[PDB]
Amino acid sequence: RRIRRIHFVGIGGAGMCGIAEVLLNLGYEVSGSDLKASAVTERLEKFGAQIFIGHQAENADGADVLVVSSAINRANPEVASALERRIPVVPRAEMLAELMRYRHGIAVAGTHGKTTTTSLIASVFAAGGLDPTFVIGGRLNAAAQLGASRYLVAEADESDASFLHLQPMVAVVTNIDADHMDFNKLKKTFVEFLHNLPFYGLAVMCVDDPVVREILPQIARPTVTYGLSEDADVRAINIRQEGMRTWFTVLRPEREPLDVSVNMPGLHNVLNSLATIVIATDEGISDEAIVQGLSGFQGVGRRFQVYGELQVEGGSVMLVDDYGHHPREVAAVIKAIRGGWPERRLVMVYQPHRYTRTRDLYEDFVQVLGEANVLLLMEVYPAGEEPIPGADSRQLCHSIRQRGQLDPIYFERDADLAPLVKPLLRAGDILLCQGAGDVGGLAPQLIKNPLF
Amino acid sequence: IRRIHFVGIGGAGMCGIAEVLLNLGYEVSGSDLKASAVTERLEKFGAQIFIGHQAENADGADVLVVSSAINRANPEVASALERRIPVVPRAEMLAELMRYRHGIAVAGTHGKTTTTSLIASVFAAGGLDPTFVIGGRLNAAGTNAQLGASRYLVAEADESDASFLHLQPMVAVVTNIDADHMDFNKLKKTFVEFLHNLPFYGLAVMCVDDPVVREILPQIARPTVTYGLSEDADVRAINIRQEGMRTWFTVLRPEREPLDVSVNMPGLHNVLNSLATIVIATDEGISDEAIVQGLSGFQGVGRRFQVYGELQVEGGSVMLVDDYGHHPREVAAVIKAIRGGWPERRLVMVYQPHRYTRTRDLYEDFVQVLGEANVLLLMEVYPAGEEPIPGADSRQLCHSIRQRGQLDPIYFERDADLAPLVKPLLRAGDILLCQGAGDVGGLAPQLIKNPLFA
Ligand SMILES: Cn1nc(Nc2nc(N[C@@H]3c4ccccc4C[C@@H]3O)nc3[nH]ncc23)cc1C(C)(C)C
Ligand SMILES: Cn1nc(Nc2nc(N[C@H]3c4ccccc4C[C@@H]3O)nc3[nH]ncc23)cc1C(C)(C)C
């Protein structure tokens, strides 16, 4: 072949080793360097990678192409050597996208629901004995050597530079939401992405989303729509909720109605399931596998995870947890609560992540955070950053308070939430723990706290 | 998707696409106003042909391909839309073909067409028979075989086409990136993005003699082979010598002995075309003998800086050159190619503007570029179905140029006889360039067979 040897600089990095593993599976020679030996380098060695510890120019000798992590500098002697001798140096994210050229690629795109849908697809495919390699957050998983399956299922992030270079056989678009970020450019991006499908590929489009519906005429590829919409090709009807479990019937062309459940509440998960069913159906997966895959799906950790119930005087409070820390993600979580439980008062705990992000998206935070009925704003999680005046939780409290609708309660990172929050809570409330940093710890503690 | 339906399948660019899709094993139907040898040929390859347009001709199509000439009101298109059948423009489906073959995409501002054709010629000499695409038309060597039969598909890649960034080549050429006579940052990014459509194991063939290509070289994270006269080019022409219509030069390639070649077309631009072709043929494993034969017996592409030969006048002769370019930027490149190859020779240019709209839109660029000739014969605008626009015609251009004091254009009408007009002006050692489309294509053939120059 033209290129035989692929050399990874920083091969122990979090998403690097998965790529190396699948390239070995494809039958390339793979070498890699890292500052530190680890179980990751050990594993790659057993799969037939040549590993170097330390960086020196000669580690790249005989490389046809380099792949570098974001942690690698251009003055790294291996990179420098490759450049001096005109060897191509490819970013990790670009090589990750390239993998779909070698497999039946199912790209899951859209603003909201990509991760859960990717994971659901993988679950249903597994139920039909297919063991797909799937990609979430740049990490490759399967259940075996990564890449063995003919199937590769991956989140497709529209802000990644390799998005418009993906070559899927099947593309999902869950929705196109431009809020809290032109809108016209975003639509065009999705249209262009869908045109990377072959003329015989498949676009799986949520017609419940107004913007998806709007761009439907521009797609010019085989399309299957899904949603609650009456004109959707694949439809959920007879939706009923039973504690944590949602039941519904799915209508599909030239098939009898199919009754399914999913063990995670909210209309958003019906839509996730629908997208999965379109893809499983088109792939020829049995009704039995679909039912089992959906039914026994646990959820993705801290993706609108319902932790259950806190006991208070006169009833209970539903506890919800989500790691989203961008305004657009938070707004969607809140909308999911308002849609699913329109009568229930929303008590939100929010911690901003990073001062830079708080500064950059400040006005959007003021708007979105103001949608809560009760707001507890936790001190910023710095993630190593120095404070920025006028761009912190105290300022946000003031910005929101000034608007006359809501009076946020500020608290510090070392405070104990349970005694703070319990006196505020009333039976029928929803308590949302929202953010990363210190927030992840909270819901597990609340659920095992004496006060509840 | 089993059945693909073409609306206007007898169109010059439509029939080739249909033929390749048949070859790939799709069912293909198409409609056209008129039966012809074109529809007959498609029938032999298994196409179902309808004469006339009616909605039901599209019944049972999984996808439509629509000619550039045909709009949404065509009953077949309307029917497909009403029933949510995907409607693909011709240009888009053309681009799709590369996914199914070893695609060689030839991009850049200047030299795409000749290079495409040269590649095809050299591949043919090595007993390959590639399908190749020039001006949206698909061709191969020897009409026996079915378009698409070869594993190779060579095509011009035009950066202004909407499907440019959807090409999926195995090999991509960039001849040059020139923004003259027309955002520059967006243009560069477009070419970078096109090159990134290559797989990590594909090949980029880059003309480093071009400043802008050289500039973007470091952003290409793909295997690259550079070509040019530049000393640092991977593939280099040296010892360039001209012998009438024939150019000799030696080509240096990595890990190879120098290779002596000739091409039967004058000008440095054709050395560069040859170099790009040699990179590609070499990388594909084509023999030195095939390369030599392919280059040597290459005539040129019709009306792409075509040298028609010689007109006889008192005291010697006039080199007749013909080119269809009708945008200022194309004309400027032609003139620069004449000034570089023949810096001593007086340039007499016949130019006909194409369209009143284009004349209006690019007016000042025409004044500037047309003013580069030593002698200028401006022919009346070719309308191409357009109504006249006041102030945007050849008479206005004559005045705009004449007022500047350097050059005094000679106006003539579309129906005038050029030969008696031009002969008394011509002097031995002139270059006579016939430049433009419309009525211009007819001129050089007539001049060469005219008694006045016999
Ligand atoms: C037929 N044909 N073929 C071309 N091919 C290439 N032309 C150039 N450049 C050019 C050149 C070179 C020397 C003198 C003038 C000019 C002007 C232009 O700038 N660069 C190249 N790289 N690879 C190929 C190639 C160009 C052309 C013209 C004559 C139709 C424009
Ligand atoms: C885990 N997860 N999964 C999602 N999946 C989808 N969410 C929506 N959209 C909307 C929706 C639907 C119901 C209630 C509220 C909202 C608001 C959201 O915008 N549309 C979809 N189409 N296909 C899938 C899908 C969404 C989410 C959240 C909860 C993290 C945002």
Coordinates of all heavy atoms in Angstrom, one line a residue, chain A residues 1-3 6 23 28 65 86 88-91 94-95 98 101-102 161 165 167-169 192 195-200 216 220-225 233, chain B residues 1 4 21 26 63 84 86-88 92-93 96 99-100 162 166 168 171 193 196-203 217 221-226 234 283:
Chain A
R1 N 0.9 -1.2 0.0 CA 0.0 0.0 0.0 C 0.9 1.2 0.0 O 2.1 1.2 0.2 CB -1.0 -0.1 1.2 CG -2.4 -0.5 0.8 CD -3.1 0.6 0.1 NE -3.2 1.7 1.0 CZ -4.1 1.9 2.0 NH1 -5.2 1.2 2.0 NH2 -3.8 2.8 2.9
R2 N 0.3 2.4 -0.2 CA 1.0 3.7 -0.1 C 1.5 3.8 1.3 O 2.7 3.9 1.5 CB 0.1 4.9 -0.5 CG 0.8 6.2 -0.4 CD -0.1 7.5 -0.5 NE -0.9 7.5 -1.8 CZ -0.3 7.7 -3.0 NH1 1.0 7.9 -3.2 NH2 -1.1 7.5 -4.1
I3 N 0.6 3.9 2.2 CA 0.9 4.1 3.6 C 0.7 2.8 4.4 O -0.3 2.2 4.3 CB 0.2 5.4 4.2 CG1 -1.1 5.0 4.9 CG2 0.0 6.5 3.2 CD1 -0.9 4.6 6.4
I6 N 1.7 3.9 10.6 CA 1.1 5.0 11.3 C 1.7 5.2 12.7 O 1.6 4.2 13.5 CB -0.5 4.9 11.3 CG1 -1.0 4.6 9.9 CG2 -1.1 6.1 11.9 CD1 -2.4 4.0 9.9
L23 N -6.9 0.8 13.9 CA -6.0 0.8 12.8 C -5.2 -0.5 12.7 O -4.9 -1.0 11.6 CB -5.0 2.0 12.8 CG -5.7 3.3 12.4 CD1 -4.8 4.5 12.8 CD2 -6.1 3.4 11.0
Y28 N -2.9 -2.1 9.6 CA -1.8 -1.2 9.4 C -0.7 -1.6 10.5 O -1.0 -2.2 11.5 CB -2.2 0.2 9.6 CG -3.1 0.8 8.5 CD1 -4.4 0.7 8.5 CD2 -2.5 1.3 7.3 CE1 -5.2 1.2 7.5 CE2 -3.2 1.8 6.3 CZ -4.6 1.8 6.4 OH -5.3 2.2 5.3
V65 N 2.7 8.3 8.2 CA 1.9 9.4 8.7 C 1.9 9.4 10.2 O 2.1 8.4 10.8 CB 0.4 9.2 8.2 CG1 -0.1 7.7 8.4 CG2 -0.6 10.1 8.8
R86 N 8.6 16.0 5.4 CA 7.4 16.2 4.6 C 6.5 15.0 4.9 O 5.7 14.6 4.0 CB 7.8 16.4 3.2 CG 8.9 17.3 2.9 CD 8.8 18.3 1.7 NE 8.2 17.7 0.5 CZ 7.0 17.9 0.0 NH1 6.2 18.8 0.6 NH2 6.6 17.3 -1.0
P88 N 3.1 13.6 6.5 CA 1.8 14.2 6.9 C 1.6 14.0 8.4 O 1.7 12.9 8.9 CB 0.7 13.5 6.1 CG 1.4 12.3 5.5 CD 2.9 12.5 5.5
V89 N 1.2 15.1 9.1 CA 0.9 15.1 10.5 C -0.6 15.4 10.7 O -1.0 16.5 10.4 CB 1.7 16.1 11.3 CG1 1.4 16.1 12.8 CG2 3.2 15.9 11.1
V90 N -1.4 14.4 11.1 CA -2.8 14.5 11.2 C -3.3 14.6 12.6 O -2.9 13.8 13.4 CB -3.4 13.2 10.5 CG1 -4.9 13.1 10.6 CG2 -2.8 13.0 9.1
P91 N -4.2 15.6 12.9 CA -4.8 15.6 14.3 C -5.6 14.4 14.6 O -6.2 13.8 13.7 CB -5.7 16.9 14.2 CG -5.2 17.7 13.0 CD -4.6 16.7 12.1
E94 N -9.2 14.2 13.3 CA -9.3 14.0 11.8 C -9.2 12.5 11.6 O -9.9 11.9 10.8 CB -8.2 14.8 11.2 CG -8.4 15.0 9.7 CD -7.4 16.0 9.1 OE1 -7.1 17.1 9.7 OE2 -6.9 15.6 8.0
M95 N -8.2 11.8 12.2 CA -8.0 10.4 12.0 C -9.2 9.6 12.5 O -9.6 8.6 11.9 CB -6.7 9.9 12.7 CG -6.4 8.4 12.5 SD -6.2 7.9 10.8 CE -4.9 9.0 10.3
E98 N -11.7 9.6 9.9 CA -11.3 8.8 8.7 C -11.8 7.3 8.9 O -11.9 6.6 7.9 CB -9.8 8.7 8.6 CG -9.2 10.0 7.9 CD -9.5 10.0 6.5 OE1 -8.9 9.2 5.7 OE2 -10.3 10.9 6.1
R101 N -14.6 5.6 6.8 CA -14.4 5.2 5.4 C -14.2 3.7 5.3 O -14.4 3.1 4.2 CB -13.1 5.8 4.8 CG -13.0 7.3 4.7 CD -11.7 7.8 4.1 NE -11.7 9.2 3.8 CZ -12.3 9.9 2.8 NH1 -12.9 9.2 1.9 NH2 -12.4 11.2 2.9
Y102 N -13.9 3.0 6.4 CA -13.6 1.6 6.4 C -14.7 0.7 6.9 O -14.6 -0.5 7.0 CB -12.4 1.3 7.3 CG -11.0 1.9 6.9 CD1 -10.6 3.1 7.3 CD2 -10.1 1.1 6.2 CE1 -9.4 3.7 7.0 CE2 -8.9 1.7 5.8 CZ -8.6 3.0 6.2 OH -7.4 3.5 5.8
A161 N -14.1 20.2 13.3 CA -13.6 20.5 11.9 C -13.7 19.3 11.0 O -13.7 19.5 9.8 CB -12.2 21.1 12.0
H165 N -16.3 16.3 7.0 CA -15.5 15.4 6.3 C -15.9 13.9 6.6 O -15.4 13.0 6.0 CB -14.0 15.6 6.5 CG -13.5 16.9 5.8 ND1 -13.3 16.9 4.4 CD2 -13.2 18.1 6.2 CE1 -12.9 18.1 4.1 NE2 -12.8 18.8 5.2
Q167 N -17.9 10.6 6.3 CA -18.5 9.9 5.2 C -19.3 8.7 5.8 O -18.9 7.6 5.8 CB -17.4 9.4 4.3 CG -16.6 10.5 3.5 CD -17.5 11.2 2.5 OE1 -17.9 10.6 1.5 NE2 -17.6 12.5 2.6
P168 N -20.5 9.0 6.4 CA -21.4 8.0 6.9 C -22.2 7.4 5.8 O -22.4 7.9 4.7 CB -22.3 8.7 7.9 CG -22.4 10.1 7.3 CD -21.1 10.4 6.6
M169 N -22.7 6.2 6.1 CA -23.7 5.5 5.3 C -25.1 6.0 5.8 O -26.1 6.0 5.0 CB -23.6 4.0 5.4 CG -22.4 3.4 4.7 SD -22.3 3.7 3.0 CE -21.2 5.1 2.9
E192 N -25.2 20.5 4.3 CA -24.0 20.1 3.7 C -23.5 18.7 4.2 O -23.0 17.9 3.5 CB -22.8 21.1 3.9 CG -22.1 21.4 2.6 CD -22.9 22.1 1.6 OE1 -23.3 23.3 1.9 OE2 -23.1 21.6 0.5
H195 N -25.5 16.0 2.7 CA -25.0 15.8 1.3 C -23.7 15.0 1.3 O -23.4 14.5 0.2 CB -25.0 17.1 0.5 CG -26.3 17.7 0.2 ND1 -26.4 19.0 -0.3 CD2 -27.5 17.2 0.1 CE1 -27.7 19.2 -0.5 NE2 -28.4 18.1 -0.3
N196 N -23.1 14.7 2.4 CA -21.9 13.8 2.4 C -22.4 12.3 2.3 O -21.6 11.4 2.1 CB -21.0 13.9 3.6 CG -20.3 15.2 3.7 OD1 -20.2 16.0 2.7 ND2 -19.6 15.4 4.8
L197 N -23.7 12.1 2.6 CA -24.3 10.8 2.4 C -24.1 10.4 0.9 O -24.2 11.3 0.1 CB -25.8 10.8 2.8 CG -26.1 10.8 4.3 CD1 -27.5 11.1 4.5 CD2 -25.6 9.5 5.0
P198 N -23.9 9.2 0.6 CA -24.0 8.8 -0.8 C -25.5 8.9 -1.3 O -26.4 9.0 -0.4 CB -23.6 7.3 -0.9 CG -23.6 6.9 0.6 CD -23.6 8.1 1.5
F199 N -25.7 9.0 -2.6 CA -27.1 9.2 -3.1 C -28.0 8.0 -2.6 O -29.2 8.1 -2.5 CB -27.1 9.4 -4.6 CG -26.9 8.2 -5.4 CD1 -27.9 7.3 -5.7 CD2 -25.6 8.0 -6.0 CE1 -27.7 6.2 -6.5 CE2 -25.4 6.8 -6.7 CZ -26.4 6.0 -7.0
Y200 N -27.3 6.8 -2.3 CA -28.1 5.7 -1.8 C -28.0 5.5 -0.3 O -28.5 4.5 0.2 CB -27.6 4.4 -2.4 CG -26.1 4.1 -2.2 CD1 -25.6 3.5 -1.0 CD2 -25.1 4.6 -3.1 CE1 -24.3 3.3 -0.7 CE2 -23.8 4.4 -2.8 CZ -23.4 3.8 -1.7 OH -22.0 3.6 -1.4
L216 N -35.9 19.9 5.2 CA -36.2 18.6 4.6 C -36.2 18.6 3.1 O -35.5 17.8 2.5 CB -37.6 18.1 5.1 CG -37.8 16.7 5.5 CD1 -36.8 16.1 6.5 CD2 -39.2 16.6 6.1
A220 N -32.3 15.9 -0.5 CA -31.9 15.3 -1.8 C -31.2 13.9 -1.6 O -30.4 13.5 -2.4 CB -31.1 16.2 -2.7
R221 N -31.5 13.3 -0.5 CA -31.1 11.9 -0.2 C -32.3 11.1 0.3 O -33.3 11.7 0.7 CB -30.0 12.0 0.9 CG -28.7 12.7 0.5 CD -28.0 11.8 -0.5 NE -26.7 12.5 -0.9 CZ -26.6 13.6 -1.7 NH1 -27.7 14.1 -2.3 NH2 -25.4 14.1 -2.0
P222 N -32.3 9.8 0.3 CA -33.3 9.0 0.9 C -33.5 9.4 2.4 O -32.5 9.4 3.1 CB -32.8 7.5 0.7 CG -31.9 7.6 -0.5 CD -31.2 9.0 -0.4
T223 N -34.7 9.6 2.8 CA -35.0 10.2 4.1 C -36.1 9.4 4.7 O -37.1 9.0 4.1 CB -35.4 11.7 3.9 OG1 -34.3 12.4 3.4 CG2 -35.8 12.3 5.2
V224 N -36.0 9.2 6.0 CA -37.1 8.6 6.9 C -37.3 9.6 8.0 O -36.3 9.8 8.8 CB -36.7 7.2 7.4 CG1 -37.7 6.7 8.5 CG2 -36.7 6.2 6.3
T225 N -38.5 10.1 8.2 CA -38.7 11.1 9.3 C -39.3 10.3 10.5 O -39.8 9.2 10.3 CB -39.7 12.1 8.8 OG1 -40.9 11.5 8.4 CG2 -39.2 12.9 7.6
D233 N -42.9 9.5 9.3 CA -42.8 8.1 8.7 C -42.8 7.1 9.8 O -43.4 6.0 9.7 CB -41.6 7.9 7.8 CG -41.5 8.9 6.6 OD1 -42.6 9.4 6.1 OD2 -40.4 9.1 6.1
Chain B
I1 N -32.4 2.2 -3.0 CA -32.3 2.9 -4.3 C -31.8 2.0 -5.4 O -30.6 1.6 -5.4 CB -31.4 4.2 -4.2 CG1 -32.0 5.3 -3.3 CG2 -31.0 4.7 -5.6 CD1 -31.8 6.7 -3.9
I4 N -32.8 5.0 -11.0 CA -32.5 6.4 -11.2 C -33.1 6.9 -12.5 O -32.9 6.3 -13.5 CB -31.0 6.6 -11.1 CG1 -30.4 6.0 -9.8 CG2 -30.6 8.1 -11.2 CD1 -28.9 5.6 -9.9
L21 N -23.9 5.0 -14.5 CA -24.8 4.4 -13.5 C -25.2 3.1 -13.9 O -25.4 2.1 -13.1 CB -25.9 5.4 -13.1 CG -25.5 6.6 -12.3 CD1 -26.6 7.6 -12.3 CD2 -25.2 6.2 -10.9
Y26 N -27.1 0.0 -11.6 CA -28.4 0.6 -11.3 C -29.3 0.4 -12.5 O -28.9 0.3 -13.6 CB -28.3 2.1 -10.9 CG -27.5 2.3 -9.6 CD1 -26.2 2.5 -9.6 CD2 -28.2 2.2 -8.4 CE1 -25.5 2.6 -8.4 CE2 -27.5 2.3 -7.2 CZ -26.1 2.5 -7.2 OH -25.4 2.7 -6.0
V63 N -34.9 8.0 -7.3 CA -34.2 9.3 -7.3 C -34.3 9.8 -8.7 O -34.2 9.1 -9.7 CB -32.8 9.2 -6.8 CG1 -32.0 8.1 -7.4 CG2 -32.0 10.5 -7.0
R84 N -42.1 13.5 -2.7 CA -41.0 13.5 -1.8 C -39.9 12.5 -2.3 O -39.1 11.9 -1.5 CB -41.5 13.2 -0.4 CG -40.6 13.4 0.8 CD -41.4 13.4 2.1 NE -40.6 12.8 3.2 CZ -41.0 11.7 3.8 NH1 -42.2 11.2 3.7 NH2 -40.1 11.0 4.5
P86 N -36.2 12.2 -3.9 CA -35.1 13.1 -4.0 C -34.8 13.5 -5.4 O -34.7 12.6 -6.3 CB -34.0 12.3 -3.3 CG -34.4 10.9 -3.3 CD -35.9 10.9 -3.3
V87 N -34.6 14.8 -5.6 CA -34.2 15.4 -6.9 C -32.8 15.9 -6.8 O -32.6 16.9 -6.1 CB -35.2 16.5 -7.3 CG1 -34.8 17.1 -8.7 CG2 -36.6 15.9 -7.5
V88 N -31.9 15.3 -7.6 CA -30.5 15.6 -7.6 C -30.1 16.4 -8.8 O -30.4 15.9 -9.9 CB -29.7 14.4 -7.4 CG1 -28.2 14.6 -7.4 CG2 -30.1 13.5 -6.2
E92 N -24.3 17.5 -9.3 CA -24.2 16.8 -8.0 C -24.0 15.3 -8.3 O -23.1 14.7 -7.6 CB -25.4 17.1 -7.1 CG -25.2 16.8 -5.7 CD -26.4 17.2 -4.8 OE1 -26.9 18.4 -5.0 OE2 -26.8 16.4 -4.0
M93 N -24.8 14.7 -9.2 CA -24.7 13.3 -9.5 C -23.4 13.0 -10.2 O -22.8 12.0 -9.9 CB -25.9 12.9 -10.3 CG -25.9 11.4 -10.6 SD -25.9 10.3 -9.1 CE -27.5 10.8 -8.5
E96 N -20.8 12.6 -7.6 CA -21.0 11.3 -6.8 C -20.2 10.1 -7.5 O -19.9 9.2 -6.8 CB -22.5 10.9 -6.8 CG -23.2 11.6 -5.7 CD -22.9 11.0 -4.3 OE1 -23.2 9.8 -4.1 OE2 -22.4 11.7 -3.5
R99 N -17.0 8.4 -6.0 CA -17.1 7.5 -4.9 C -16.9 6.0 -5.3 O -16.6 5.2 -4.5 CB -18.5 7.5 -4.2 CG -18.8 8.9 -3.6 CD -20.1 8.7 -2.8 NE -19.8 8.4 -1.4 CZ -19.8 9.3 -0.4 NH1 -20.1 10.5 -0.7 NH2 -19.5 8.9 0.8
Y100 N -17.2 5.7 -6.6 CA -17.3 4.3 -7.0 C -16.1 4.0 -7.8 O -16.0 2.8 -8.3 CB -18.7 4.3 -7.7 CG -19.7 4.9 -6.7 CD1 -20.4 6.1 -7.1 CD2 -19.9 4.5 -5.4 CE1 -21.3 6.7 -6.3 CE2 -20.8 5.1 -4.6 CZ -21.5 6.2 -5.0 OH -22.4 6.8 -4.2
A162 N -20.9 23.9 -6.9 CA -21.4 23.6 -5.6 C -21.0 22.3 -5.1 O -21.0 22.0 -3.9 CB -22.9 23.8 -5.6
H166 N -17.7 18.3 -2.3 CA -18.3 17.0 -2.1 C -17.5 15.9 -3.0 O -17.9 14.7 -2.9 CB -19.8 17.0 -2.3 CG -20.5 17.7 -1.2 ND1 -20.6 17.0 0.0 CD2 -21.0 18.9 -1.0 CE1 -21.3 17.8 0.9 NE2 -21.5 19.0 0.3
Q168 N -14.9 13.2 -3.8 CA -14.1 12.3 -3.0 C -13.0 11.6 -3.9 O -13.2 10.5 -4.3 CB -15.0 11.2 -2.4 CG -16.0 11.8 -1.3 CD -15.2 12.1 0.0 OE1 -14.6 11.3 0.6 NE2 -15.3 13.4 0.4
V171 N -6.8 11.0 -5.7 CA -5.7 11.9 -6.1 C -6.3 13.2 -6.5 O -7.2 13.3 -7.3 CB -4.9 11.3 -7.3 CG1 -3.6 12.2 -7.6 CG2 -4.5 9.9 -7.1
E193 N -9.8 22.8 2.1 CA -10.8 21.9 2.4 C -11.0 20.8 1.4 O -11.3 19.6 1.7 CB -12.1 22.6 2.7 CG -12.2 23.3 4.1 CD -12.1 22.4 5.2 OE1 -13.0 21.5 5.4 OE2 -11.1 22.5 6.0
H196 N -8.4 18.2 1.8 CA -8.7 17.4 3.0 C -9.9 16.4 2.7 O -10.1 15.6 3.6 CB -9.0 18.3 4.2 CG -7.8 18.9 4.8 ND1 -7.9 19.9 5.8 CD2 -6.5 18.7 4.7 CE1 -6.7 20.3 6.1 NE2 -5.8 19.6 5.5
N197 N -10.5 16.5 1.6 CA -11.4 15.4 1.2 C -10.7 14.1 0.8 O -11.2 13.1 0.7 CB -12.4 15.8 0.0 CG -13.4 16.8 0.4 OD1 -13.6 17.0 1.6 ND2 -14.1 17.4 -0.5
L198 N -9.4 14.3 0.4 CA -8.5 13.1 0.2 C -8.6 12.2 1.5 O -8.6 12.8 2.6 CB -7.1 13.5 -0.1 CG -6.8 14.2 -1.5 CD1 -5.4 14.8 -1.4 CD2 -7.0 13.1 -2.5
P199 N -8.5 10.9 1.4 CA -8.2 10.1 2.5 C -6.8 10.3 3.0 O -6.0 10.9 2.2 CB -8.5 8.7 2.1 CG -8.3 8.7 0.5 CD -8.7 10.1 0.1
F200 N -6.5 10.0 4.2 CA -5.1 10.1 4.8 C -4.1 9.4 3.9 O -2.9 9.8 3.9 CB -5.0 9.8 6.2 CG -5.0 8.3 6.5 CD1 -3.9 7.5 6.4 CD2 -6.2 7.6 6.9 CE1 -3.9 6.2 6.7 CE2 -6.2 6.3 7.1 CZ -5.0 5.5 7.0
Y201 N -4.6 8.4 3.1 CA -3.7 7.6 2.3 C -3.8 8.0 0.8 O -3.2 7.4 -0.1 CB -4.0 6.1 2.3 CG -5.5 5.8 2.0 CD1 -5.9 5.5 0.8 CD2 -6.4 5.7 3.1 CE1 -7.3 5.1 0.5 CE2 -7.7 5.4 2.9 CZ -8.1 5.1 1.6 OH -9.5 4.8 1.4
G202 N -4.5 9.1 0.5 CA -4.5 9.6 -0.9 C -3.3 10.5 -1.2 O -2.3 10.5 -0.4
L203 N -3.3 11.2 -2.4 CA -2.2 11.9 -2.8 C -2.6 13.3 -3.3 O -3.5 13.4 -4.2 CB -1.4 11.2 -3.9 CG -0.3 11.9 -4.6 CD1 0.8 12.1 -3.6 CD2 0.2 11.2 -5.8
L217 N 0.7 24.9 1.3 CA 1.4 23.6 1.4 C 1.4 23.0 2.9 O 1.0 21.9 3.1 CB 2.8 23.7 0.8 CG 3.3 22.4 0.2 CD1 2.5 21.9 -0.9 CD2 4.8 22.6 -0.2
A221 N -2.5 18.1 5.3 CA -2.0 17.0 6.1 C -2.3 15.7 5.4 O -2.9 14.8 5.9 CB -2.7 17.1 7.5
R222 N -1.8 15.6 4.2 CA -2.0 14.5 3.3 C -0.6 14.2 2.6 O 0.1 15.2 2.5 CB -3.1 14.8 2.3 CG -4.4 15.0 2.9 CD -5.0 13.8 3.4 NE -6.4 13.9 4.0 CZ -6.7 14.6 5.1 NH1 -5.7 15.1 5.9 NH2 -7.9 14.8 5.5
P223 N -0.4 13.0 2.1 CA 0.8 12.8 1.3 C 0.8 13.7 0.1 O -0.2 13.8 -0.6 CB 0.7 11.3 0.9 CG -0.2 10.7 2.0 CD -1.1 11.8 2.4
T224 N 1.9 14.4 -0.1 CA 2.0 15.5 -1.1 C 3.3 15.2 -2.0 O 4.3 14.9 -1.4 CB 2.1 16.8 -0.4 OG1 0.9 17.0 0.3 CG2 2.3 18.0 -1.4
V225 N 3.2 15.5 -3.3 CA 4.3 15.5 -4.2 C 4.2 16.9 -4.9 O 3.2 17.2 -5.5 CB 4.3 14.4 -5.2 CG1 5.3 14.5 -6.3 CG2 4.5 13.0 -4.5
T226 N 5.2 17.7 -4.8 CA 5.3 19.0 -5.4 C 5.9 18.9 -6.8 O 6.6 18.0 -7.1 CB 6.0 20.0 -4.5 OG1 7.3 19.5 -4.4 CG2 5.4 20.1 -3.2
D234 N 9.6 18.5 -5.9 CA 9.9 17.1 -5.8 C 10.1 16.6 -7.3 O 10.9 15.7 -7.5 CB 8.8 16.3 -5.2 CG 8.6 16.6 -3.7 OD1 9.5 17.1 -3.1 OD2 7.4 16.3 -3.3
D283 N 3.3 7.7 -9.9 CA 2.7 7.2 -8.6 C 1.8 6.0 -8.9 O 1.7 5.2 -8.0 CB 2.0 8.3 -7.9 CG 1.2 7.8 -6.7 OD1 1.9 7.5 -5.6 OD2 0.0 7.7 -6.8

